[PDB]
Short mmCIF file of C-alpha atoms and ligand atoms in Angstrom, two decimals:
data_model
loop_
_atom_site.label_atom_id
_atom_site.label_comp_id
_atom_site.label_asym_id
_atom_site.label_seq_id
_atom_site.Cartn_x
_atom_site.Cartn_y
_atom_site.Cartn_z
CA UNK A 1 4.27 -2.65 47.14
CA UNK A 2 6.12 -0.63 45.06
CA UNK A 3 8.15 -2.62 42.55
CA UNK A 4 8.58 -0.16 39.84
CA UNK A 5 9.43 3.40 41.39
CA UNK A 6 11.60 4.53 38.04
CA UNK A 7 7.90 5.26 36.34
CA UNK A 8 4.27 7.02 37.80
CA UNK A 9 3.03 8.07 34.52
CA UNK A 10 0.78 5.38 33.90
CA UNK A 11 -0.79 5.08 37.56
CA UNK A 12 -4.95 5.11 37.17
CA UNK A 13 -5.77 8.76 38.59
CA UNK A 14 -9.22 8.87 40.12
CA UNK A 15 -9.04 11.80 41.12
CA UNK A 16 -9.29 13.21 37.35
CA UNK A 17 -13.09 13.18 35.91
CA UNK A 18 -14.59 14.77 33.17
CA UNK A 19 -16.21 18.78 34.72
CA UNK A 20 -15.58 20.77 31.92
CA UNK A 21 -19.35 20.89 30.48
CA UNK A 22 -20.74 19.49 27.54
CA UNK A 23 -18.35 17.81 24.75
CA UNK A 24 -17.84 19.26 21.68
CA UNK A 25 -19.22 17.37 18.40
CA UNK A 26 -16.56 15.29 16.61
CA UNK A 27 -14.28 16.76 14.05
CA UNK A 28 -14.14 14.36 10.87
CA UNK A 29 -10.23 14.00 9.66
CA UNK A 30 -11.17 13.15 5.67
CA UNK A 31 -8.08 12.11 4.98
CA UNK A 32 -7.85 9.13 7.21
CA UNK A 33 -11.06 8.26 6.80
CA UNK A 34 -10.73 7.77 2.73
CA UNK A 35 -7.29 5.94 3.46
CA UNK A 36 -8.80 3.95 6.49
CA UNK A 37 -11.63 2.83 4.25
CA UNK A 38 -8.88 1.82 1.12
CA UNK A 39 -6.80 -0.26 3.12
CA UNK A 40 -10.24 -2.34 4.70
CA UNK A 41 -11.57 -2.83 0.78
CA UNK A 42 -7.81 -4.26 -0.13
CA UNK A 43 -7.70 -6.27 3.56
CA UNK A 44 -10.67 -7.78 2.13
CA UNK A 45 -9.91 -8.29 -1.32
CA UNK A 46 -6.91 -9.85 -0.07
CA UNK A 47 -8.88 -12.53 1.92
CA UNK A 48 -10.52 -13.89 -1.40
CA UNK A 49 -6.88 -13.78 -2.84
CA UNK A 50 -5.58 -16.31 0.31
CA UNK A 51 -6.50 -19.33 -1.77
CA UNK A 52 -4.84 -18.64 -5.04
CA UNK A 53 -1.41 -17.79 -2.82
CA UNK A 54 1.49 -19.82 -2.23
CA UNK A 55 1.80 -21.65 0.64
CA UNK A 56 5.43 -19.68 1.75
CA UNK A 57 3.00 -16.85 0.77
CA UNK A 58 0.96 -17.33 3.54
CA UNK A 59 3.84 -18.10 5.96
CA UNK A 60 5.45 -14.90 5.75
CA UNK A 61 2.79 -13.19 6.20
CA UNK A 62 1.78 -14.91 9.97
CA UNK A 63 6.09 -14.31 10.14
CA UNK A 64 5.13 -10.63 9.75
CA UNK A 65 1.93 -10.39 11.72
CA UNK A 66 3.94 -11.92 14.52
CA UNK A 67 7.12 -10.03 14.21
CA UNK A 68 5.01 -6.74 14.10
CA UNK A 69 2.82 -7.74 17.41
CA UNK A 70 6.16 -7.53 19.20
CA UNK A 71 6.87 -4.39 18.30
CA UNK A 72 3.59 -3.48 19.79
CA UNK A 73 3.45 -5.85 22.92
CA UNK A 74 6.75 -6.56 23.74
CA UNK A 75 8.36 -3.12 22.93
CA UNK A 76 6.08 -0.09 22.48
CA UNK A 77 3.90 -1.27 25.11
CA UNK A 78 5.80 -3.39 27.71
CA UNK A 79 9.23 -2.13 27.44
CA UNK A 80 8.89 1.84 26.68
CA UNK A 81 5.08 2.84 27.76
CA UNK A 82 5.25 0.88 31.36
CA UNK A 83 9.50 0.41 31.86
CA UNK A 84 8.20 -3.18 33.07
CA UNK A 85 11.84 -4.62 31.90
CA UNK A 86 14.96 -3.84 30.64
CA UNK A 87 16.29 -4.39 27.25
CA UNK A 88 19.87 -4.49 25.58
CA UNK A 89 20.79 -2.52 22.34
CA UNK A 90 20.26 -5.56 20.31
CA UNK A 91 16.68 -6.87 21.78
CA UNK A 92 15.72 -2.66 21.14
CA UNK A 93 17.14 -2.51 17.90
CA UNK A 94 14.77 -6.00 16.79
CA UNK A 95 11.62 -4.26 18.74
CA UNK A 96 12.11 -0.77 16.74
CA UNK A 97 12.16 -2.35 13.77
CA UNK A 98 9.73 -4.39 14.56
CA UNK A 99 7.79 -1.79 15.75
CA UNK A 100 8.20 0.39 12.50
CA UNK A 101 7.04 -2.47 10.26
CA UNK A 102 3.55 -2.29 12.31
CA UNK A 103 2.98 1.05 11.78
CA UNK A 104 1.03 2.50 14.65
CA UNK A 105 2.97 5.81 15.03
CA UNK A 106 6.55 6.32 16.52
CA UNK A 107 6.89 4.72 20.12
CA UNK A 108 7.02 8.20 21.53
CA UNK A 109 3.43 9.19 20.24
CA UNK A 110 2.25 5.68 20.60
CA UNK A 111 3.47 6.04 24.23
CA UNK A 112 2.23 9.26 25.16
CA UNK A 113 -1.19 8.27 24.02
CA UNK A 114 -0.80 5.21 26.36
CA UNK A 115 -0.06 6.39 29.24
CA UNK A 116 -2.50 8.91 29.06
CA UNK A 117 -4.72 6.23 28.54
CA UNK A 118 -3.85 4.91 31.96
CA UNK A 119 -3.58 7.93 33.81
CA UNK A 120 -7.24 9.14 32.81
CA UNK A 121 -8.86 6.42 31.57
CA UNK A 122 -12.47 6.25 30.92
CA UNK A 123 -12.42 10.43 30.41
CA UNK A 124 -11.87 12.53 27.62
CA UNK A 125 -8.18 12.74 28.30
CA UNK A 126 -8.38 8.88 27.28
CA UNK A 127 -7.29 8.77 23.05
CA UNK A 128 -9.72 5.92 22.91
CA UNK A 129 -12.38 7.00 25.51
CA UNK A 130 -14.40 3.78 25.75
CA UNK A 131 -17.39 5.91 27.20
CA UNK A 132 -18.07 6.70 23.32
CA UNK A 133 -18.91 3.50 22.36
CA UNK A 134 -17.58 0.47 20.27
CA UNK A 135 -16.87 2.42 17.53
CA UNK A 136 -14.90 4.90 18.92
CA UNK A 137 -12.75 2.80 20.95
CA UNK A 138 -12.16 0.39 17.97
CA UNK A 139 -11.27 3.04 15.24
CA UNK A 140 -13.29 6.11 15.52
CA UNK A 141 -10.79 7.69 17.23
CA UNK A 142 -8.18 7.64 14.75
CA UNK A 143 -10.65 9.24 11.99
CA UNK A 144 -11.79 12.58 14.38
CA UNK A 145 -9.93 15.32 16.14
CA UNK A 146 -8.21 13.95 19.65
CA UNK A 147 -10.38 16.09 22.77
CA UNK A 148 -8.34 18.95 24.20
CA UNK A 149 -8.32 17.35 27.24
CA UNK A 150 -5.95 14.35 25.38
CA UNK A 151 -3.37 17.06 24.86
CA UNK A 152 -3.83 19.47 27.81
CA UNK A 153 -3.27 16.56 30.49
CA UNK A 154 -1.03 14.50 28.19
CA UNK A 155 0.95 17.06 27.59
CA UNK A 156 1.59 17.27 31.57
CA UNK A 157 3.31 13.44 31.63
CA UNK A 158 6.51 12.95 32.23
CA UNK A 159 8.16 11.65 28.63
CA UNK A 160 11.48 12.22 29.58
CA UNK A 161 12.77 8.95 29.51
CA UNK A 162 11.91 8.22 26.22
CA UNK A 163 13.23 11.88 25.27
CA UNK A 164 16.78 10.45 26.88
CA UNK A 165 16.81 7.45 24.59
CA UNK A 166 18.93 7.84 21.68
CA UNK A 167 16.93 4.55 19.66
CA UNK A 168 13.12 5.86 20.36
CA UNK A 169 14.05 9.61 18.94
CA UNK A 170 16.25 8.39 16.02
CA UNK A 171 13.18 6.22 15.14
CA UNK A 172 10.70 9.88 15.40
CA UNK A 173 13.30 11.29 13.05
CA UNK A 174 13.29 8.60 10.57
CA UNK A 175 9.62 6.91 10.88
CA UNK A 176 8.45 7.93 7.54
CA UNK A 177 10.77 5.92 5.00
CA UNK A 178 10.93 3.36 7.72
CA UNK A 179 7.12 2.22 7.87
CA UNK A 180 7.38 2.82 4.08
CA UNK A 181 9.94 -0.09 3.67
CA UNK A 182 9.25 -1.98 6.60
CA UNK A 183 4.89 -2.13 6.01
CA UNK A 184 4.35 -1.86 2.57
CA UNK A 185 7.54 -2.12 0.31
CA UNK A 186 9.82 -5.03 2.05
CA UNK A 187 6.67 -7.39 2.56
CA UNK A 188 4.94 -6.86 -0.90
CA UNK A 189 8.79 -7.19 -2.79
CA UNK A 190 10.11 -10.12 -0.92
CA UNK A 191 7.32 -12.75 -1.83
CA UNK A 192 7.49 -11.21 -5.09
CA UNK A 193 10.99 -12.22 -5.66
CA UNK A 194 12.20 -14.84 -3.40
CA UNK A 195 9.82 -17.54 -4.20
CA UNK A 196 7.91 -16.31 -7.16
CA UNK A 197 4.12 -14.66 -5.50
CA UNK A 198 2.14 -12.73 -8.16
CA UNK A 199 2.47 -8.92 -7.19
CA UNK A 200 -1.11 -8.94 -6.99
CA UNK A 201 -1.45 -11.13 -4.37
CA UNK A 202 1.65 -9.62 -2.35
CA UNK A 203 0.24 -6.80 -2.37
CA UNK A 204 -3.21 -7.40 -1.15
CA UNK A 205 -2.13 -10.52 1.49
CA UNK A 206 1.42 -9.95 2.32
CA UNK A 207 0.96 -6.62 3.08
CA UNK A 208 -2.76 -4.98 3.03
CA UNK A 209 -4.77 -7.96 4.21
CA UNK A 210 -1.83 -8.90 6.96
CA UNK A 211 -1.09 -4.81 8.10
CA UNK A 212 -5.08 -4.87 8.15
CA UNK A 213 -5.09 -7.94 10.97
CA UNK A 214 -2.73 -6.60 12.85
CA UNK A 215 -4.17 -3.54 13.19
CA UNK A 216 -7.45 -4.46 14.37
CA UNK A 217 -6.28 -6.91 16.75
CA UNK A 218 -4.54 -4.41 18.30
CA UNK A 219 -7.90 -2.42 18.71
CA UNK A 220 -9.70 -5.02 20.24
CA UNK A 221 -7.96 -4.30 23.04
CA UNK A 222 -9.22 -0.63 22.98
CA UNK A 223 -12.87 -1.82 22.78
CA UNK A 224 -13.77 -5.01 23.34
CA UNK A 225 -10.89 -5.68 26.41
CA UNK A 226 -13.19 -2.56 27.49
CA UNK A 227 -16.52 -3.86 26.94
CA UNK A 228 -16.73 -7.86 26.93
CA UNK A 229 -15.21 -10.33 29.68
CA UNK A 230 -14.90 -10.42 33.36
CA UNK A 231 -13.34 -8.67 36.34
CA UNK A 232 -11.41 -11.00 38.11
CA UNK A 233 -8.62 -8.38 39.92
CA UNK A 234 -10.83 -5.07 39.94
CA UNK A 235 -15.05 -4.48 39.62
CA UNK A 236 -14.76 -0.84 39.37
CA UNK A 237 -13.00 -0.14 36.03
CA UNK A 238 -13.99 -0.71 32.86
CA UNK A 239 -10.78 -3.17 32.04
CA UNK A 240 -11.91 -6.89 30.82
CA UNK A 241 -10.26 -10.11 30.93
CA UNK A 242 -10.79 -11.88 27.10
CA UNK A 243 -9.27 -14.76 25.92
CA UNK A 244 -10.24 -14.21 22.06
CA UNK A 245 -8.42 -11.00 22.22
CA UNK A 246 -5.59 -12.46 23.97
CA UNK A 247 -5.39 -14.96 21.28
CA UNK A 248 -4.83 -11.79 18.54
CA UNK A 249 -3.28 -9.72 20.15
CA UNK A 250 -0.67 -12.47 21.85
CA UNK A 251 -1.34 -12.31 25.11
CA UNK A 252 -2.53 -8.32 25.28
CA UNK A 253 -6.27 -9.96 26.37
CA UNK A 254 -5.86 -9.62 30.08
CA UNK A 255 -6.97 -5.97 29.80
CA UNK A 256 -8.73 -5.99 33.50
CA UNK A 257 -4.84 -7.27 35.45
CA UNK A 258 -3.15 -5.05 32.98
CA UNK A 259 -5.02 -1.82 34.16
CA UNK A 260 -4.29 -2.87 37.71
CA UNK A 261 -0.96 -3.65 37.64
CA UNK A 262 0.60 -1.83 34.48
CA UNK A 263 3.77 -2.17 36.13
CA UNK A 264 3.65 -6.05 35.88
CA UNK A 265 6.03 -7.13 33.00
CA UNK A 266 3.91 -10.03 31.77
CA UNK A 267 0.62 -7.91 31.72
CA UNK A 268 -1.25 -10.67 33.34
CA UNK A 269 -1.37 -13.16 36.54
CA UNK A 270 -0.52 -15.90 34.27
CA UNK A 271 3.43 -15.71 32.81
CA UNK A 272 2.92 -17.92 29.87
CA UNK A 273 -0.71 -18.64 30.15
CA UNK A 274 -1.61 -17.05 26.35
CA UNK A 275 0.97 -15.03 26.40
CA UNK A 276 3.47 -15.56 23.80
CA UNK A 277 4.91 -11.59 24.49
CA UNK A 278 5.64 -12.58 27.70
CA UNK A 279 6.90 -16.25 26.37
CA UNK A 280 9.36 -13.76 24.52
CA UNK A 281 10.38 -11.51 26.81
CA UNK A 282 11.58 -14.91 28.88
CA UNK A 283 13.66 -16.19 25.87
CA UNK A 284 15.44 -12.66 25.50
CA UNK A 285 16.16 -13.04 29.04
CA UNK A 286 17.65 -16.14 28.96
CA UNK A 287 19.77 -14.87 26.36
CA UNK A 288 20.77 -11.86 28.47
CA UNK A 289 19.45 -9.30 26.90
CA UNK A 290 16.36 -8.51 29.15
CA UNK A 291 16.72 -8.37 32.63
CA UNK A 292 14.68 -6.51 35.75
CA UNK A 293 10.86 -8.05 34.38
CA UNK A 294 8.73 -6.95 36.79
CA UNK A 295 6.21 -9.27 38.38
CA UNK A 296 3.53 -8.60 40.89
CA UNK A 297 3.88 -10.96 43.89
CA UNK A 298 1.54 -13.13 44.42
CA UNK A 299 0.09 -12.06 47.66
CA UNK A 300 -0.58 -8.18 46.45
CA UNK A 301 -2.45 -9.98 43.83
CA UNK A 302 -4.60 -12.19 45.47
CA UNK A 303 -5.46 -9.47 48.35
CA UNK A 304 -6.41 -6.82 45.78
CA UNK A 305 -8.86 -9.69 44.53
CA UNK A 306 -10.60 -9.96 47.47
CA UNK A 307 -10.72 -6.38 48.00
CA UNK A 308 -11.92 -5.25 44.47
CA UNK A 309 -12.81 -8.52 42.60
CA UNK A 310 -15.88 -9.41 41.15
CA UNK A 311 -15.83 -12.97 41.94
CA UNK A 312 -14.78 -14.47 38.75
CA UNK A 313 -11.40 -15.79 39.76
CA UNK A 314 -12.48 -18.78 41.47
CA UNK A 315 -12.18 -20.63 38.19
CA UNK A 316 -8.55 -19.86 37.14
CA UNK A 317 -7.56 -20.44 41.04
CA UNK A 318 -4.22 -22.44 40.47
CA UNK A 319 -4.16 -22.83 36.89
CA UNK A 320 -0.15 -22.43 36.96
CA UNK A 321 2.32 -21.86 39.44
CA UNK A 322 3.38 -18.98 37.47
C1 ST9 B 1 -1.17 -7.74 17.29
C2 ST9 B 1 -0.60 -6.62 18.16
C3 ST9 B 1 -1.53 -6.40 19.36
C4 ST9 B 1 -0.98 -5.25 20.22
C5 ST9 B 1 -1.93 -4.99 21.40
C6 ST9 B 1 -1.36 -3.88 22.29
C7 ST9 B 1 -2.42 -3.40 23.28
C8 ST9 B 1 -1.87 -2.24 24.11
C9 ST9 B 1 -2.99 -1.56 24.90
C10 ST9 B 1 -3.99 -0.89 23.96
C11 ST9 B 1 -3.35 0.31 23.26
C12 ST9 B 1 -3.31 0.07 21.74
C13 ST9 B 1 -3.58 1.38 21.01
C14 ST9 B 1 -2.62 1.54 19.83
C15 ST9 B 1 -3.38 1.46 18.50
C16 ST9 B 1 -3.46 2.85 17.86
C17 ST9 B 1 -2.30 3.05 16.89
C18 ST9 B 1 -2.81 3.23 15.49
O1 ST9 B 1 -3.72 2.55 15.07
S1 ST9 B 1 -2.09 4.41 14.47
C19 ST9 B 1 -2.39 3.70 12.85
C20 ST9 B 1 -1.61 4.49 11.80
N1 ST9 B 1 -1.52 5.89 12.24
C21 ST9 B 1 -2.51 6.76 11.92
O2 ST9 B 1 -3.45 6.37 11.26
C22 ST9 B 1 -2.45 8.19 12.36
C23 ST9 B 1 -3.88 8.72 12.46
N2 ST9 B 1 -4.02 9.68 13.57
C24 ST9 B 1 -4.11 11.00 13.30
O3 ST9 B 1 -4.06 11.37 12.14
C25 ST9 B 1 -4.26 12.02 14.41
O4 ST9 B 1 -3.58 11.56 15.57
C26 ST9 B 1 -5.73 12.28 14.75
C27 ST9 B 1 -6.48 12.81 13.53
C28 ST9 B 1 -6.41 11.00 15.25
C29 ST9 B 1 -5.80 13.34 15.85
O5 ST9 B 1 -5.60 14.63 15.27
P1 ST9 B 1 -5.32 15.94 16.16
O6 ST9 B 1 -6.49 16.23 17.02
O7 ST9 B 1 -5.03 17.19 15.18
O8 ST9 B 1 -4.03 15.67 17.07
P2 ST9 B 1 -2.50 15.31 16.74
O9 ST9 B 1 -2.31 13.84 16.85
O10 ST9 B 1 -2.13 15.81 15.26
O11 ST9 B 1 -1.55 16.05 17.81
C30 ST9 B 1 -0.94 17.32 17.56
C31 ST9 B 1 -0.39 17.87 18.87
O12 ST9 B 1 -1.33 17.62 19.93
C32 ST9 B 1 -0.62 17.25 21.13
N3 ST9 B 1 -0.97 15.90 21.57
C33 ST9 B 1 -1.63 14.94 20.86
N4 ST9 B 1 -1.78 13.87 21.58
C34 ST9 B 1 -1.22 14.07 22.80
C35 ST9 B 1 -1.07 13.29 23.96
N5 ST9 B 1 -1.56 12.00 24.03
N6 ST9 B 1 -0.45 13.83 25.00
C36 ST9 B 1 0.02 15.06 24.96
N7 ST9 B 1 -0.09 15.83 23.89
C37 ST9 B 1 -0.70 15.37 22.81
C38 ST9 B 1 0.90 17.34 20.79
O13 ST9 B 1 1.41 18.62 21.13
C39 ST9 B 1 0.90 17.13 19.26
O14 ST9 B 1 2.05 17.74 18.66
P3 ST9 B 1 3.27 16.89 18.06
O15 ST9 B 1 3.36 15.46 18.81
O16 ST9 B 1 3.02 16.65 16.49
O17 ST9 B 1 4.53 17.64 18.26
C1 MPG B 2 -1.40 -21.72 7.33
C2 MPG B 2 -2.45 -21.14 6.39
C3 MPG B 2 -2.75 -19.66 6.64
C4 MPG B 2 -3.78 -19.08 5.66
C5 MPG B 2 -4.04 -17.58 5.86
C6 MPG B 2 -2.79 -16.70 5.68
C7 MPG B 2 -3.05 -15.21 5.91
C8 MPG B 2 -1.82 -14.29 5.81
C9 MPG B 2 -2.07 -12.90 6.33
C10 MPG B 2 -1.91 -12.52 7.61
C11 MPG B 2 -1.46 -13.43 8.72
C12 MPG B 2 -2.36 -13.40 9.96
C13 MPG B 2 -1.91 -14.30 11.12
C14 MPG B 2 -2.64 -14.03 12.44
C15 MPG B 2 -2.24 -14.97 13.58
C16 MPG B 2 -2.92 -14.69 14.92
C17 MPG B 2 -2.77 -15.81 15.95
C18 MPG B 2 -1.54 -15.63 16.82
O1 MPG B 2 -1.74 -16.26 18.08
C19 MPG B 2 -0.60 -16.64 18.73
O2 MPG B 2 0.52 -16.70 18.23
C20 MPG B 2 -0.91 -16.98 20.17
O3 MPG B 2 -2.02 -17.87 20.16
C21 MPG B 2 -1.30 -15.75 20.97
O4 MPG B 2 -0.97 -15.91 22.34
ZN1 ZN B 3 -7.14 -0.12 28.04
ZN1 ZN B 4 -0.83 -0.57 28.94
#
């Protein structure tokens, strides 16, 4: 059925395929490549720091890695790439902060990338075209030149509705001094001062090591959610079901549902089943400030199962009843 008419933009498109002749090579971006390789060498300088930190030290920075994930999950992706809900002025203003302090671009590029992503994945209009390999998918992408098919049939979807929203531009306008403060100055400074952390070790753990983590659990779900797991809901697309990458990227793992129903709210069969986004998105409901989640009924899902399944889902039959 069709339970979320408002949006099209990130329906799978078969019909699109790659016919435009041989790819071009790969255009190296230098600059993100030097910083890209910086911020992995301090990541991992601040993992042989983690001992020698406090233990509030340490806290803050899961605080932080969690906080941010929402503002991927629960807000860039959920709420303003798919429309699966609706959120109040106050629930938005916590998810475009919280968005801002991950630093992954503005929602409006991170969403036009997305649903692009949807529309034509698998092809060269896909940002993180799987097809390339591990690398690619992971973080390859973000170190060459995006294929001119990325912004010939991106630039063809519908962004309109995040155009309209007065939040998601004033964000555009004002992303640089926000992921300044909210990724690198606010976490390093506030260990420093409120309970005494070395600026050393805020530096490298409360802000490189933890921005570091969240990042790449957020591209696990770009290549291995398209390379390792089963396919439980559809056989024919590259999406895959994995737990581990669940487990990062809270609740994000069910890549192979996700793909088949990006309309559902909870991005997977499961509601709470590892899925503390979704676990979220419940508790800002009963709060009233999220209303119209969008769930796919349970009958659509177990019919497109047995029509495009690969046979895996006979051993999470029943698991919960939602
Ligand atoms: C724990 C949390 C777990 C969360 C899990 C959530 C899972 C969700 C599902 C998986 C998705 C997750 C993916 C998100 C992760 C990636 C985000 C980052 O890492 S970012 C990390 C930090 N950020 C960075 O590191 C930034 C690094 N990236 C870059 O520097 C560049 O983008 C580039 C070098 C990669 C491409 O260079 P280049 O080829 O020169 O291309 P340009 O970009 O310069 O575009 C210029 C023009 O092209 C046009 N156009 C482009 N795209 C589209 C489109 N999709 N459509 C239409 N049109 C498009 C457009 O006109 C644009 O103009 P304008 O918008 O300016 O007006
Ligand atoms: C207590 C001692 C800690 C020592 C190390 C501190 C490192 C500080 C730096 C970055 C924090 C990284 C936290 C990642 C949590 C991911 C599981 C998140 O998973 C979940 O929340 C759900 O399982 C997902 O559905
Ligand atoms: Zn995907
Ligand atoms: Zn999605």
């Amino acid at each position: 059925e069709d339970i979320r008419p408002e949006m099209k933009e990130d329906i799978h498109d078969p019909t699109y395929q790659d016919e435009e002749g041989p790819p071009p090579k790969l255009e190296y971006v230098w600059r993100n490549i030097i910083l890209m390789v910086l911020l992995h060498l301090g990541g991992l300088y601040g993992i042989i720091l983690v001992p020698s930190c406090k233990l509030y030290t340490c806290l803050f920075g899961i605080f932080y890695y969690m906080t941010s994930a929402l503002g991927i999950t629960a807000g860039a992706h959920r709420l303003w790439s798919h429309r699966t809900y609706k959120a109040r002025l106050p629930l938005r203003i916590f998810l475009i902060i919280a968005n801002t302090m991950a630093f992954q671009n503005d929602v409006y590029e991170w969403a036009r990338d997305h649903r692009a992503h949807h529309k034509f994945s698998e092809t060269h209009a896909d940002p993180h075209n799987s097809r390339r390999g591990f690398f690619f998918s992971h973080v390859g992408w973000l170190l060459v030149r995006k294929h001119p098919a990325v912004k010939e049939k991106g630039g063809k979807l519908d962004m309109s509705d995040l155009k309209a929203e007065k939040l998601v531009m004033f964000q555009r306008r004002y992303y640089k001094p926000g992921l300044l403060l909210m990724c690198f100055i606010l976490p390093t400074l506030v260990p420093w001062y409120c309970w005494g952390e070395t600026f050393v070790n805020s530096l490298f753990v409360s802000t490189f090591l933890r921005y570091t983590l969240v990042l790449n659990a957020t591209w696990l779900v770009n290549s291995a959610a398209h390379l390792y797991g089963y396919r439980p809901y559809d056989k024919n697309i590259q999406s895959r079901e994995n737990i581990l990458v669940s487990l990062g990227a809270v609740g994000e793992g069910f890549h192979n549902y996700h793909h088949t129903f990006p309309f559902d709210y909870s991005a997977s069969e499961y509601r709470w089943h590892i899925n503390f986004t979704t676990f979220f998105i419940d508790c800002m409901a009963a709060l009233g400030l999220a209303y119209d989640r969008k769930k796919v009924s349970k009958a659509t899902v177990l019919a497109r199962i047995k029509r495009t399944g690969d046979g895996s889902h006979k051993s999470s039959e029943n698991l919960y009843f939602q």
